[PDB]
Amino acid sequence: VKNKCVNFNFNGLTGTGVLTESNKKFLPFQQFGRDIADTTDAVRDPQTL
Amino acid sequence: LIANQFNSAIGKIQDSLSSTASALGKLQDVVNQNAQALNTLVKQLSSN
Numbered sequence: 802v803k804n805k806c807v808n809f810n811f812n813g814l815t816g817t818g819v820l821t822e823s824n825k826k827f828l829p830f831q832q833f834g835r836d837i838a839d840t841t842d843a844v845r846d847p848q849t850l
Numbered sequence: 851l852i853a854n855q856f857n858s859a860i861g862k863i864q865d866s867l868s869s870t871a872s873a874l875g876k877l878q879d880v881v882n883q884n885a886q887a888l889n890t891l892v893k894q895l896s897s898n
């Protein structure tokens with residue numbers, strides 16, 4: 802789902818928030834990004850890269 | 851006369867402010883301090 806508060810779980814990585822398609826361009830090997838505060842900010846759909 | 855001195859006096863302040871980024875030392879510090887504390891306050895989360 803998108804644009805609704807949910808309890809997402811990515812490859813065991815969990816959390817709560819709203820998921821939208823980003824603009825950031827990871828390197829292919831890079832799995833998922835973060836913030837200055839070490840906080841999760843970006844995810845890569847494992848099934849939808 | 852005094853007009854010229856005053857009017858010229860203002861002009862320096864512009865350039866005494868235009869380039870010397872250390873002019874606003876105090877204000878920039880206060881914002882700096884608070885920003886850091888929040889980082890420290892946030893960063894404490896990740897500690898067991």
Ligand SMILES: *[C@@H]1O[C@H](CO)[C@@H](O)[C@H](O)[C@H]1NC(C)=O
Nearest residue numbers: 829844845846847848849850
């Ligand atoms: C499995 O994942 C890959 C890459 O994300 C995708 O191309 C493939 O089609 C997926 N399997 C199915 C049945 O869609």
